[PDB]
Amino acid sequence: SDLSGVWDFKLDNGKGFEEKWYEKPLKDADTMPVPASYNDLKEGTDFRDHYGWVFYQRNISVLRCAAVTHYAMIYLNGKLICEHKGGFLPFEVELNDDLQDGDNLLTIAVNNVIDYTTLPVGGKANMMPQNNPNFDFFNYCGITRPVKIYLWQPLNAYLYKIYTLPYGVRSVRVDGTKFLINEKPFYFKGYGKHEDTFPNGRGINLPMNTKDISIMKWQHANSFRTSHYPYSEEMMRLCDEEGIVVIDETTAVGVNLQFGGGANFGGERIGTFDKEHGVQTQEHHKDVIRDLISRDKNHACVVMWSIANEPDSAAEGAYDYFKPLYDLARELDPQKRPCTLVSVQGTTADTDCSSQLSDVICLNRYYGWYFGGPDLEVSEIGLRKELSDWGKLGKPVMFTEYGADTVSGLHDTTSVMYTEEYQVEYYEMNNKVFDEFDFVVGEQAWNFADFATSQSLLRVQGNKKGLFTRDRKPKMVAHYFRNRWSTIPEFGY
Amino acid sequence: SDLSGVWDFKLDNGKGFEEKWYEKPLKDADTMPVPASYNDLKEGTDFRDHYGWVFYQRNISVLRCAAVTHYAMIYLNGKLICEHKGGFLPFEVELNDDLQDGDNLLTIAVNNVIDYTTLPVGGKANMMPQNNPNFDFFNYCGITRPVKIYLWQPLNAYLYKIYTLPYGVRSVRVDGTKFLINEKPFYFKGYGKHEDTFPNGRGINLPMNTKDISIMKWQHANSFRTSHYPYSEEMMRLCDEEGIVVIDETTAVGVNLQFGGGANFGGERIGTFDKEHGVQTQEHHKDVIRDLISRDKNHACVVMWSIANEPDSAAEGAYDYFKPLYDLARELDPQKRPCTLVSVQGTTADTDCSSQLSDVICLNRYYGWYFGGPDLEVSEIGLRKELSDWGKLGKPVMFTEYGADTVSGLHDTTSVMYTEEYQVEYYEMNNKVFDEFDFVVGEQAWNFADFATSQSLLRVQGNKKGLFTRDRKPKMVAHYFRNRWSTIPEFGY
Amino acid sequence: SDLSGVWDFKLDNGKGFEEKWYEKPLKDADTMPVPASYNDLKEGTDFRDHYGWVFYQRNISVLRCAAVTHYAMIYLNGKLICEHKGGFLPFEVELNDDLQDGDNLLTIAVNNVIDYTTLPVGGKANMMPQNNPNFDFFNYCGITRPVKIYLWQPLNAYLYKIYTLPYGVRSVRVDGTKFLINEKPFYFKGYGKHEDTFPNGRGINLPMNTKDISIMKWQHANSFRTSHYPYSEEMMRLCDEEGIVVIDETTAVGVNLQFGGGANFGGERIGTFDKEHGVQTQEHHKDVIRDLISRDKNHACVVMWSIANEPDSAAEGAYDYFKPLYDLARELDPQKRPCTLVSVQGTTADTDCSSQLSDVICLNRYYGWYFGGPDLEVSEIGLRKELSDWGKLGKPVMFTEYGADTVSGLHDTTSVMYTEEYQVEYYEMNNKVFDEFDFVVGEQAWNFADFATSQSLLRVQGNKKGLFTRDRKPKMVAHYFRNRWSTIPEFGY
Amino acid sequence: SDLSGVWDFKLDNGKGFEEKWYEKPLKDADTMPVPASYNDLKEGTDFRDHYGWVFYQRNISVLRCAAVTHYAMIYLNGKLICEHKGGFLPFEVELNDDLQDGDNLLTIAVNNVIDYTTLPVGGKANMMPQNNPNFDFFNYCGITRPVKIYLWQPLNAYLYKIYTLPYGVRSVRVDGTKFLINEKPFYFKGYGKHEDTFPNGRGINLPMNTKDISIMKWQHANSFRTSHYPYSEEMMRLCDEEGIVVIDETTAVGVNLQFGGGANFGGERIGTFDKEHGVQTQEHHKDVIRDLISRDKNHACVVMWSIANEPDSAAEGAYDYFKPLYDLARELDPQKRPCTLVSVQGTTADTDCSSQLSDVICLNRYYGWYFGGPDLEVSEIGLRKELSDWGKLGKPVMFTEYGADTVSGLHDTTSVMYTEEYQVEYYEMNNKVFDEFDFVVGEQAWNFADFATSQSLLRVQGNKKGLFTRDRKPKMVAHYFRNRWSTIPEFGY
Ligand SMILES: CNc1ccc2c(n1)sc1c(N3CCN([C@@H]4O[C@H](C(=O)O)[C@@H](O)[C@H](O)[C@H]4O)CC3)nc(NC)nc12
Ligand SMILES: CNc1ccc2c(n1)sc1c(N3CCN([C@@H]4O[C@H](C(=O)O)[C@@H](O)[C@H](O)[C@H]4O)CC3)nc(NC)nc12
């Protein structure tokens, strides 16, 4: 029985836990539908940028939270039943006990604070009393996912059935510079995505998920990556049904304290993996890895794991941080699927700890935007120079992010940055260099669609690097990729 | 237990009922989330404009359809359990019988054909093998609403509780030219709405519903009308919680065969209420009235009933068609709430059968757009001339529709039609005349937000008359109304 | 010596000619730059839509009007020196006499009234006290063009020199179904243009002219048509320098009283060439033909004459109206260049008087917009059916107009009318049928850029059929044509 | 006699002066209209971003350059006649000599290089082989202005006449904290402008000038500033006719080497007024001051001089640089008009050398954008704190720049940066603080309209801080200012 609906809702002030609001029904309360991120569902900056706790509550009568972002505190008649740290993976509690009679009071308290102990991690200032994300997307929070009571081929799916669980048969493993599904040389076509819609924020959107898949099949794409967090269970099963290759990724974005900017302790900047003042996320990072792999163990669409997005991988302490997490990933994946991490700009093949730990090299490069733009010729020289050097490893290289901010509507015959023409030229140059090297095994544009971020001078009402707008309407670049991807097969490219 | 999820889906070809698809599991099937309109969830004109039947199916293990648009045909292991005509109101069936063991096959067949027998009615051509709506919104179909197994004051709501059902205490009745809630002279502030979002089509959107309410409270609005169909049960309860005045309306739009255009039988145009060739919707019209009132009997937000939107009310046979439906409305409303109908342009106080049957006169006037535009001065003369004549009845007059198509982004200091400036000037002129007459008891703009329609030369990617865009972003007119409505109280204006 | 600058300016009230304003300096006067259309240079609908006369004036000290739209009345110290009817071709007067001493008073009175006696002709209502154009562009008026005192190959121009006059050598003549320049089979690539910029209105814009040419060479175009009026002398010489093929056209648009709509005399609609109540433009039509050809006699870019745009050519009296004008065109063109007229939708090869008089058949067809849209398949059947029938004449057929209104920014993966995707699909279908017939010798899209029109429900802030916006920014269709035209040569296609 | 037209044109390669192109007619030449900036009149980044010299040429038969940006080199039959450094003020040469017979060859060579010796000054990198402007507008170059051969009250102009020269009588002088025109306390209402249109670049646009004035009178504005360079003579006379208060400004923008960024000599950053490595513009700065004041000596609209825009005025050497230029300004202004300079963010009353030299304090502050955004509350605290401190001087304070980048079309009910709502809120906060202090004597928004800049991550297709778009269409903020300025008089506020 799904508990999804409009619940009672109130923000803490913060004299909430003192007055024991989880015992009595909330007075002067608001309304809020679940599942949904609450940030965009009321008006006013003080509500959207609220710092602290919120109180959901709903009656019951006669429990698995699919996701609660970030920190959940479940109650019943006042007695705490659960606690959970981790805003993008499910958790459940037993309720045979503590469920009195009929008319009972279920309260869910949700916290949004992010720091060096959370995944994603929150910095102390802007990346590009308040939360300051160390990541480039908005800190949507609340009960994002529902609360309920209780040969396979890319683009050519076939799932047998087996509680009933669907399953698809497929082999995936890496040989040299080749990514093989069912022993055939695959090429990744697609994007890095976001669970981002209006006004749901990060709340699950089954209609948009299907529309996203239809658009991808319209665009002749085959893959995407769950940047920068594991998606909903329903979206994963859909890729199983629809035959969409997925790269599952953990909530480990922002373990890199070189943005912006930086953080100082004693008049000196601190490194990322400083044991005393740096990140305190390791033991939670593996908790997320073992919780993720336990969830999507059997999804034939899951093809490769991503331990972290854009970490300080070329810094002191980077190897000793990721080695125990990498090993764990191979330890609990019964299929021994490839594992990787997506690398920031500035990483080279020699300095990246991913050069050894990862089966596949996954790059996030912005030659022609953050680097070199608007000089596409100079940026081409650099992209080729770094890409040649990455071939020294004899591993598959894969671009997981590359893009240019483009506001839909801006045009010029002599293109400039932020126009739709410049975006197509940016991708033309990059794709031209990608086609020169036989060890690249995929292109994944950033982003699939425009998505909301925190406010800054460098973000024009969110991140505009999508091929599509936030309402999924195509920019000119979306028709460019559709034509290019129509001549690039899934296997043998 | 909510059955909402992604189901199996296929379109009929139309050799579907022959091959008995409702018995065996569907081969070569697609995917489709419910609840949602399917029209926008795949790509291609042939899918969006599909004519005929679609087949939903979902397994069961151990039934109330909140809405199925338009015609539902429920199955189980092959045996038909139900049929329902009526795309916007709930229906249920008993399932103690016919539910074998555990693993069973629930199939829902949905038809989209509209004609002179349906509400809404479908014409034979464009209003402004295919369905041609006699109404100005898109023919979204599918399982729009979920399938599940089992003193009050405006803007100041208070609902006692009482199965548990919430209830709010309030008095509503008409005295002379005054609309009184709790014996105080009310003024309607708001819009005509639509259940229209992307990509859900008409599918229920609990996030957008709350965002809509927040925007209305941001804009200092108090009311809206369920144009042109009854909304979801969840949206009605939200207006109860949030204290939003609602005008409940039936699915009776398009009982007017003077659009465009017209229909001919024997070389001669036929009237609307021709008994042989005209509308065949009467007995279904009261079925909808008795089904609607049975659903929202106790919603304190429901304040007035609307029997039909824009009917041929000044034509022969109009009185004898609406008299038995009007009487029924007063017969089954235990509160004796006011009843009305919203009148097309061209109606006068003398010729409208609503002049006698309705407690409140509800007008849809476009002085300054369809009539007179771009001459706002001439259009002002006409609006005053017709409005003065409507005062002869000593009844409350209320504008339920007035607006000008405005594409967000188009501006000029010397305004022209379709720009944001012209839209504000259009509303300034109209509102100026409204303030001259003490018998007008409300203004409701058309529309609240841009919504999808059928394609025509006169529709610029849908209906653009919204104060907000389809993604709820405000046009300049939305800030004009917010300032005007901030100085107009709920009572005593 | 150029008199171009900001002059004194005032609108008549209309007690202007009584008070003899042309004698004394204008009191309570405004400012206005020449050359420019005055309509958009002040604010307010009453100024933009002004009906009647305006008064320019400027001092002199010690005369050829390049164009005065429409009717000019030149003065000096009060004494009338000139009168001119014809808003788009030059006229001059002698000034040795009437020029006293030094400080003198030059007044130019300009009228904007259009009716059945003017070219372009003004109707009595909207086409789709006030001027109501029988043409689809705005009635910009004022001193549009400056007032001053005193082998060639397409895309490969070479002009010898010869008062000094430049000249280019080239042969043009029609053989069968072939348009030959220098005895090679040409193909027209380009558009119908407009002298339309902001805020100049129709005023000459030498910067935009060069930018237009650069954009055409960027788009791999070779031709355009001076729709619907002869352009400036400077623009013609530029096409001589830049090697751009031009189709010179007269001011004869709107000699067709079947728009909208129509005009009635005695309870009955009147035909276009009714001698008593219809058009009274014939003797002025040849005055324009002999004035035009006298101006561009030597422009090597002028390749074909266009007697009228979209006339009632399949109606009674159409042949006897155009025969004396056609003959005149061949009489005064010392090069015997081809002559034609562009035909409205609904014209067939049998009924069009252009089927006999014209050397080249020039069609304005909207299969997929005005006809058939949004059914591109049905519209394709019609375009092929009419195009096949036009081949019966053994003449060259050329499309001078075809397009779909497109507001820059509107997109959908499943296209609908007014989006950028639908515009590309519209042109794809049309161009596919054009490539099936060897007797079509050119495609000219409508329009090159968005331009201002009179206000109506069918015009979304002007005409949006341009491949480019009014500020020359490209829509998606502009890159489609650039790719298609890059593979289509000038000769031998 | 105006030489304005389309000339021969070619870019140097750079073997141009060797081959003596100024002697023979240019082979393989292009076309270019004058007056106009050439940068946007052809296609391709290599043309728009061309570094070096361009060659204009035009025949003559039987000379004052109104502006040539930046460096002019005039020829005739090969013999150099002139040289001029200074891209925004007129210069002339005698031609009785050197003018042979009739058919002669006039060549104008134009250079675009900017460095520490030019005004405006060019840096070595981006401010926010190539020119890198130290200013926030595009380096438009070419023959921008024409080449030719030969009581007053704000908003209530009256000019007597007096070669004939118009003149207007008015008194202007500063008393305490009051700016008085005709001994009445004035308040500046308006903006900082730019000579920026499409596609003319910085080329003179008499139509747009009049449209700009009409829009200002529509918006109830009274003043603007010639940021950041003296405008055309025609625009100045128009403000005389139309009664628009102007603040004339020199070409002295970018004398501040703290942008971005900075420049290093020997591993150390150099100060702005370093005599050896810093700016070398002083003696040219006064040449511009004495050339400017010699031009607009008699314009009654000129009300105050601006010596430089945003200089390093709080740095070592700043006082000794501006003292001789300031004194010169009072030396040659026969009216002893006030003189000032507009100050960068970060300047305080104590450290600004303008605190002593200037009669009026002119600030460029961005509280709520560059500083504090999106925290409008915190930014309000700062604006009040700095504004209170500026009152210690007992002088008039005037804001010459304040604004937020706004892309037309972006909206949200809960505003974020770059939307139209945030722009209105930004101006509401600022204007609220301005109204608290009686010593502020004007508000001038930045900018009047969107204008082109060099490309950077921080510039969304140019500078979007305009109240209007580049095609003069109003954003929502333009209607906010129109309402505010309608209640603020010219005198006595
Ligand atoms: C097959 N079914 C139908 C039914 C009605 C009509 C048509 N087809 S076609 C047409 C029309 N046109 C007038 C304009 N003409 C060109 O079209 C451009 C544009 O419309 O954009 C114009 O800008 C340009 O100046 C013109 O040369 C094209 C024909 N006018 C009116 N008046 C009610 N009705 C119709
Ligand atoms: C308080 N915290 C900070 C931090 C950094 C900066 C500021 N405040 S302020 C500023 C700046 N400005 C330069 C431009 N100047 C005006 O602004 C207009 C515009 O920016 O739109 C311009 O179009 C117009 O021409 C100019 O007169 C305004 C100052 N430049 C740079 N270079 C990295 N940094 C900063």
Automatic annotation (TrEMBL), chains A, B, C, D:
Q: What is its EC number?
A: 3.2.1.31
Q: Which SUPFAM superfamilies match?
A: (Trans)glycosidases, beta-Galactosidase/glucuronidase domain, Galactose-binding domain-like
> Start and end of every Glycosyl hydrolases family 2 sugar binding domain?
1-150
Enumerate the spans annotated as Glycoside hydrolase family 2 catalytic domain: 172-488
The record ties this protein, via PROSITE patterns, to:
GLYCOSYL_HYDROL_F2_1, GLYCOSYL_HYDROL_F2_2
| Keywords recorded for this protein, A-Z | Glycosidase, Hydrolase, Plasmid
Q: Does the keyword Hydrolase apply?
A: yes
Is-annotated flag, keyword Ligase?
Answer: no
Q: Where does beta-D-glucuronate bind?
A: 136, 310, 370, 401, 446, 459, 463, 465
The text of the family note is:
Belongs to the glycosyl hydrolase 2 family.
Q: Which NCBIfam families match?
A: PRK10150.1
Give the protein's recorded name.
Beta-glucuronidase
